[PDB]
Every structure is written in C-alpha cells, then in structure tokens.
Amino acid sequence: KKKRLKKRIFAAVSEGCVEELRELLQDLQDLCRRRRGLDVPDFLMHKLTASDTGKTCLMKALLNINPNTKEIVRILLAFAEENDILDRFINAEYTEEAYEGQTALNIAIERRQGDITAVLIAAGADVNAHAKGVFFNPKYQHEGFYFGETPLALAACTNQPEIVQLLMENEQTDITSQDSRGNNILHALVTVAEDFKTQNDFVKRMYDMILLRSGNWELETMRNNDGLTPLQLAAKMGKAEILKYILSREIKEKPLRSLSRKFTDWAYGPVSSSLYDLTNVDTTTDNSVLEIIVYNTNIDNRHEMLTLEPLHTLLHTKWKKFAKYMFFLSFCFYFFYNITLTLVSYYRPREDEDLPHPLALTHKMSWLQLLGRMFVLIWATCISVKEGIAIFLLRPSDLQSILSDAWFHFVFFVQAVLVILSVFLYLFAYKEYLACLVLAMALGWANMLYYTRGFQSMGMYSVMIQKVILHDVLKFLFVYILFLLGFGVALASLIEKCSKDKKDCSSYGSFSDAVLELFKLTIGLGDLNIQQNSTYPILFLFLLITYVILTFVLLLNMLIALMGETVENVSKESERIWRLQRARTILEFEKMLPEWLRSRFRMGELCKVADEDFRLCLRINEVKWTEWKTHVSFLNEDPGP
Amino acid sequence: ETVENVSKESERIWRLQRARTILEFEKMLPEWLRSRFRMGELCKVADEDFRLCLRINEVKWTEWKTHVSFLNEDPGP
Ligand SMILES: NCCOB(c1ccccc1)c1ccccc1
Ligand SMILES: NCCOB(c1ccccc1)c1ccccc1
Numbered sequence: 001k002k003k004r005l006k007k008r009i010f011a012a013v014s015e016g017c018v019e020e021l022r023e024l025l026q027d028l029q030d031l032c033r034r035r036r037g038l039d040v041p042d043f044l045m046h047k048l049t050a051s052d053t054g055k056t057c058l059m060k061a062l063l064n065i066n067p068n069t070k071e072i073v074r075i076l077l078a079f080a081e082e083n084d085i086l087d088r089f090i091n092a093e094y095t096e097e098a099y100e101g102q103t104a105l106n107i108a109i110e111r112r113q114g115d116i117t118a119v120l121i122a123a124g125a126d127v128n129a130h131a132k133g134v135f136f137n138p139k140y141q142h143e144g145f146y147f148g149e150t151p152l153a154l155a156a157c158t159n160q161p162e163i164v165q166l167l168m169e170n171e172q173t174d175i176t177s178q179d180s181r182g183n184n185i186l187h188a189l190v191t192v193a194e195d196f197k198t199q200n201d202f203v204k205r206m207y208d209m210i211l212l213r214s215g216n217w218e219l220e221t222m223r224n225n226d227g228l229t230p231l232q233l234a235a236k237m238g239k240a241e242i243l244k245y246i247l248s249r250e251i252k253e254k255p256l257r258s259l260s261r262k263f264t265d266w267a268y269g270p271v272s273s274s275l276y277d278l279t280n281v282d283t284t285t286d287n288s289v290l291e292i293i294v295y296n297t298n299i300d301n302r303h304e305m306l307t308l309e310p311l312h313t314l315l316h317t318k319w320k321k322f323a324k325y326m327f328f329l330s331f332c333f334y335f336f337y338n339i340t341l342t343l344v345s346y347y348r349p350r351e352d353e354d355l356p357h358p359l360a361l362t363h364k365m366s367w368l369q370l371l372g373r374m375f376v377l378i379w380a381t382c383i384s385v386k387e388g389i390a391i392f393l394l395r396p397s398d399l400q401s402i403l404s405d406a407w408f409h410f411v412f413f414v415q416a417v418l419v420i421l422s423v424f425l426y427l428f429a430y431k432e433y434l435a436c437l438v439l440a441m442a443l444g445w446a447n448m449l450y451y452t453r454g455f456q457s458m459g460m461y462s463v464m465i466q467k468v469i470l471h472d473v474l475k476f477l478f479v480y481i482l483f484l485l486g487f488g489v490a491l492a493s494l495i496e497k498c499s500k501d502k503k504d505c506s507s508y509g510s511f512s513d514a515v516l517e518l519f520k521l522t523i524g525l526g527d528l529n530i531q532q533n534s535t536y537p538i539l540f541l542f543l544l545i546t547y548v549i550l551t552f553v554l555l556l557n558m559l560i561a562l563m564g565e566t567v568e569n570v571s572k573e574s575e576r577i578w579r580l581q582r583a584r585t586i587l588e589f590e591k592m593l594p595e596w597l598r599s600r601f602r603m604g605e606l607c608k609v610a611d612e613d614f615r616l617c618l619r620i621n622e623v624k625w626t627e628w629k630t631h632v633s634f635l636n637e638d639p640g641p
Numbered sequence: 642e643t644v645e646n647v648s649k650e651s652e653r654i655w656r657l658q659r660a661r662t663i664l665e666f667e668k669m670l671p672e673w674l675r676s677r678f679r680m681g682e683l684c685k686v687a688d689e690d691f692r693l694c695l696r697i698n699e700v701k702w703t704e705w706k707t708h709v710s711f712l713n714e715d716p717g718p
Contacts, residue, residue, distance in 0.1 A: 063713035064709070064713070065707065065709060066709075098715060098718075099715075111707050111708075112705065112707050113707070133715075134715075135715055141699055142699055142716075143715045143716055158705065159703070159705065194702065196702075199702060199703045200703065202703075560643060560647060560648075563643045563644070563647070563648065564643065564644065564645075564647070564648030564649070565644055565648070566644070567644055
C-alpha cells in the first residue's frame with residue numbers, strides 16, 4: 001500500500017515530537033486533497049488506525065508518554081476537529097480479539113493522566129465504554145486485571161479518586177451499568193479489593209465514595225450473571241475488609257442515611273445501642289451471607305469474617321437460643337445409640353442362648369430388652385437417610401475440603417449403613433455377620449469426636465487430634481516403619497541365620513517374628529525370651545538399644561515437629577478451625593429445623609427514615625466508651641417498654 | 642527458640658538440601674533435549690531482535706507510577 005505516511009506518524013507520535021508532526025499534518029492535508037470521494041472518514045481511519053490490532057493514533061499517543069503529550073493530544077484532537085471525524089476518532093476501539101473495547105479513554109485513565117482525561121471527556125469520549133478482551137482470564141494471576149471493563153470502574157479500581165470525581169459528575173455516565181459478567185461497579189471493587197490491611201486502603205474509601213456520590217439503594221440489589229449481590233460477592237470471594245464496611249456502613253448525614261446498614265437505637269453518653277439493617281445477612285432468604293460464608297470452602301479467612309459484629313452475635317444467638325439444645329439432644333440420642341450396640345452384642349447377662357444374634361427380634365422379649373434393639377434400627381436408618389441426601393448435595397465440597405470438614409457426614413453414614421448391612425447380612429447369613437457389625441460399633445464410639453465440638457476447649461483439643469492424625473502421623477509413621485524395617489533386617493540375621501541355641505521349634509515366620517519382637521518394644525511389651533542365643537546376645541542387645549534410642553529421637557523430634565509457633569499457631573489455628581467447624585453445624589441445624597415455628601430471633605422492625613413503619617429486620621447491640629461525640633442519630637431514649 | 646530457630650533453620654537447611662539435588666539432576670540430564678525453560682528472547686534496546694534469554698513474572702499493587710517501560714500490551718499470542 002506504500003504506507004510511508006502511516007508508520008512515519010506513529011513513530012513521531014511515539015516520540016511525542018510536535019514540530020515533526022506538524023509537517024506530517026500538512027502533507028496529509030494535501031493527501032486528503034488528492035482524492036475526495038470518501039473525503040475525511042474512510043481515508044484518515046485507514047491512516048490513523050492500524051490494520052490488524054485496530055490501535056489508533058490517539059491510543060498510540062497514550063501508550064507512550066513524554067511531557068509533550070499534553071500538547072500532542074490537543075493536536076491530534078484538533079486534527080480530528082478540523083476534519084470533523086472526532087466522534088469515531090475519540091471512541092475507536094481495538095478490533096483485536098485480546099482488547100475488545102480498550103478505548104482511548106480507558107488507556108488515558110490507565111496512565112493516570114487526570115488533566116488529559118478531562119480534555120477527552122470535553123472532546124466527547126465515550127465514558128460508558130466496555131473492554132471485553134481476553135484480559136478477563138480465569139487463569140487470573142497472569143495477564144489478567146479484571147476491573148469490570150468500564151472507564152468509571154477503572155479509575156475506581158486504580159486509586160484515581162479525582163477521575164471518579166470527574167466521571168461521576170458527567171451526567172452521561174451510566175453508574176448503574178453492568179458487565180459481560182453482569183457486574184456493576186460495586187462488584188468490580190469487590191473483585192479487586194485485597195485482604196491486605198490498610199494499603200492506604202483506597203477501595204473501602206472509594207466503595208464509600210461511589211454510594212455517597214450517587215445512587216439509591218437500587219445498586220446493591222443488582223445481581224451479576226451468577227446472581228450475587230455485592231454483599232454476597234464480597235462473601236463468596238472472601239474479601240473480608242470490604243465486608244467489614246458493608247455490614248457496618250454508618251452514615252452520619254440526613255439526605256442519605258437510608259443507605260446505611262448500621263443504625264443507632266439510642267445514644268446516652270458512653271453507652272449506646274446499635275442496630276443492623278441485616279436484610280440479606282441472616283439465613284432467611286435463598287443463598288444468604290452466612291450461607292455463603294460458612295458453607296464456602298474456597299476462601300482462606302472464614303474466621304476473619306465471622307468475627308464481624310453482624311455475623312458474630314447472630315451466630316451466638318442462633319447458638320444460645322437454638323443450636324445448643326439441639327446439639328445436646330442429638331448428643332444424648334447418638335450416645336445412647338452407641339451404648340445400645342455395646343449393651344446388645346457384648347453384654348451376655350448370664351449364659352447367652354448358644355451364640356445368639358444381636359439385632360434379632362425373637363418371639364418373646366420384654367419391652368425393655370428389645371426396644372433398644374428397635375432404637376438402634378430406627379436411629380441408624382434416621383442417620384442413613386440424612387446424609388444420603390448429602391450425597392445429592394455435596395458434590396464439590398468433599399474433594400476441595402480434602403482434610404478440613406464434611407468428613408463427619410461420611411463417617412456417620414458409613415457407621416449407619418454397616419449397622420443396616422449387618423441386618424441385610426442376617427437375611428443371607430454369610431460369614432461376615434459379626435465382622436460388619438463391629439466396625440460399625442468401632443466407628444460408633446469413634447464418631448463421638450463429632451460431639452467433642454461444643455465446649456470451647458474440648459474441640460480445640462479434638463482439632464489437634466484431627467490435625468496430627470491427618471497431617472503428621474503419616475509423617476512419623478513413614479520414618480518409624482523405616483527404622484523398623486531397617487533394623488528388622490539387621491535383627492533377622494540373629495534369627496534363622498545366627499546361633500539361636502534352641503530355636504526353630506516355636507511357631508513360624510523368621511523375618512516376621514524378628515520384626516514383631518522388635519515392634520513390641522514401642523508398646524513397652526518387651527520380651528526377653530525371644531533373645532536366648534550364643535554370645536551374640538552381647539551384639540543383640542546393643543543393636544536393640546540402638547533401636548530404642550533411634551526410636552526415641554524419632555519420638556523426641558516428633559514433639560519438636562509439632563513445635564514451631566506452638567505458642568501461637570498450633571493453638572490459635574486449632575481454635576479458629578474449631579469455630580468454623582462449629583458454625584457449620586449450627587447452620588446445618590437450621591436446615592434440620594422445620595419451616596413452621598421459626599418464631600425466634602431477628603428483632604423488631606423499627607423505622608429507617610421512610611414512610612413505612614416496619615422497614616427492615618434488625619439486631620441490637622451495646623457499644624461503649626471514649627471518643628465521645630454529640631450524637632444526632634435517632635429516638636433519644638432508652639429502648640422502651 | 643524452638644518457636645523460631647529449631648523449626649526455621651531445619652526448614653532452610655532442607656531447602657538448600659533439596660536445591661542441591663535439583664542441580665545435581667541437571668548434571669544427570671543428558672545434553673540433548675534440554676528443550677525446557679529459559680523463556681523467549683525478546684529485545685532489550687538494540688538492533689538485534691533476540692538479545693538475551695528471559696524469565697517472566699507477575700508483580701503487583703500499590704505505589705503506582707505512570708509507567709514508561711516497554712511494549713504496552715498484554716503478553717501476546
Ligand atoms: N460471643 C460470641 C459467641 O459465639 B461464637 C461461637 C462460639 C462457639 C461456637 C460457635 C460460635 C462466635 C461467633 C462468631 C465469631 C466468634 C465467636
Ligand atoms: N434425621 C437425622 C437426625 O439426626 B441427627 C444428626 C445429623 C447429622 C449428624 C449427627 C446427628 C440429630 C440431630 C439432632 C439431634 C438428634 C439427632
């Protein structure tokens with residue numbers, strides 16, 4: 001095409017040079033003179049825009065930047081103004097698939113140029129643009145930076161408060177606008193705002209700024225293409241610090257304190273009562289906040305989120321009024337359950353009826369000695385149906401929570417089924433009649449570890465059991481097998497190859513007996529009679545002493561293996577795992593609670609500002625001392641009769 | 642200092658005692674087909690296109706600056 005005009009400009013634009021560019025303009029003005037069938041638009045947009053990427057001359061002026069860019073934007077605008085093509089020039093996009101809608105306004109906000117940005121808006125740049133390129137990236141950590149693709153959110157995402165102050169004063173700016181993911185702007189701040197504390201933290205300061213700049217309540221009711229409110233999106237993404245704002249959000253004004261989530265009942269000196277607006281927070285709607293915090297597995301800091309005041313005292317009140325008494329009730333049922341399996345099989349009052357059958361319901365039984373056998377058959381089937389529904393529900397949780405929680409759904413289910421399969425085994429009478437019963441009884445007492453939740457230090461001990469058995473027993477066992485099998489070959493010279501003095505007359509297993517008589521020492525159930533040889537018992541015992549010392553050092557380092565911030569981390573994480581593993585039980589009990597008579601918490605519906613008396617459901621607290629202020633909040637009283 | 646030193650030094654001795662294995666395996670790896678890492682040879686400033694071997698990372702947030710560095714894009718097809 002002999003494009004000696006186009007590439008000459010884009011270099012001179014990248015230089016930012018003015019005087020060389022002014023020469024390039026009058027040559028192009030004469031080049032516009034040479035043909036006038038398509039006068040300005042379709043000739044200059046073949047000259048000012050790259051072919052493949054669609055990168056224009058103005059975006060090239062904003063990728064590279066030097067102190068002549070404050071002038072060279074004006075010249076490239078006045079060139080489009082003198083040629084009356086500015087609207088398709090100020091609002092041109094990448095035709096490239098990776099940057100679909102990266103406009104010149106986005107790339108000017110991207111380079112954080114506040115003075116140049118106001119010129120482009122005054123030149124008529126599209127403020128409601130959308131950049132739908134491949135920078136969305138499910139593989140997020142590289143080439144990503146999702147920001148909700150609008151020019152308003154991009155200044156909102158990249159700490160540009162003055163440009164947000166500029167863009168939201170433009171009346172053409174669609175603040176309520178959505179994304180390809182359905183995200184509005186408050187979704188976009190949620191999906192960026194990290195759980196780093198105070199990175200001169202701008203997002204919470206700017207999430208604050210957008211709602212107070214403009215907006216009714218009809219912005220956080222907007223759902224994305226997952227159907228999530230920005231409160232729910234802040235919970236599902238687990239961004240804790242932005243969610244400490246949304247659940248508090250006290251607004252001390254009176255045009256727009258209706259947007260506030262925290263209120264005041266009354267204020268009287270250093271004692272004051274706080275009220276929470278609590279709409280989607282409580283487990284009363286579909287996919288509530290506690291529904292999407294506590295059942296979530298993906299995020300790390302669930303405990304850092306449930307410490308927050310609207311979630312905390314609500315979880316305490318569900319605990320005290322409701323879930324404590326069901327837990328003790330479901331304790332005493334499943335505890336009398338396991339006593340019954342112990343008192344049916346292994347009781348034998350006097351002289352049982354010639355190898356009986358445990359769960360049998362024979363012709364004459366007094367109604368104290370077989371109703372317990374009915375009590376097992378009911379409450380095993382009651383458990384077997386319950387987590388059988390959890391097969392239909394917990395499809396992704398089990399593999400993602402590979403060690404943390406929801407194992408106790410399984411171990412209850414395996415224990416309940418093997419009781420029932422022992423009854424199915426009776427109807428066919430195979431060899432494993434007693435075998436499937438006892439593993440059902442052994443798990444039944446091992447299942448009481450699920451009821452070791454409930455006391456504040458009891459599960460905090462029980463989680464430390466679940467930590468060592470899952471993580472660090474297989475650590476120790478793989479080394480302990482190793483020196484076992486290491487010295488065991490060294491010991492099994494002194495069996496079957498050495499003196500032995502009387503042996504090859506006892507049972508079997510030359511290597512196996514040498515292992516086991518070295519393996520009984522860790523119990524302390526030590527045998528001397530296996531060692532009677534000829535003059536090698538000098539060499540036997542000093543070998544076997546170096547087993548005990550070596551398997552002391554494996555034991556002594558095992559205590560140090562749990563050490564390393566045991567003053568903090570082994571104690572505190574086992575506490576915070578426990579509080580999450582008890583808060584998941586409580587919301588599970590509300591699924592167990594029938595829909596009728598939830599006449600419970602969710603306190604009285606006092607006014608907010610508006611004409612309706614009952615506006616919203618509430619939650620009352622008791623906040624405290626210093627940093628006084630002369631309050632202008634609410635009904636100035638004590639709470640009332 | 643088991644809270645710090647017995648735990649942390651045993652970790653840092655281990656990372657050195659695993660990083661010595663890895664460079665030992667490259668001596669074990671035959672010279673043919675080391676078609677591996679050492680990413681693409683992009684420009685530096687100069688007239689040669691391939692200037693030097695590279696390594697790509699993914700750096701992050703606050704303390705922004707208006708950048709004047711390089712090819713102003715996302716990494717490319
Ligand atoms: N006073 C709070 C009592 O409830 B908390 C609680 C106690 C035991 C089990 C489950 C919850 C609690 C709730 C949220 C954050 C921290 C603790
Ligand atoms: N329909 C199944 C009920 O089983 B319950 C139960 C469910 C899961 C895990 C453990 C027990 C139960 C709950 C409260 C009190 C008593 C029992």
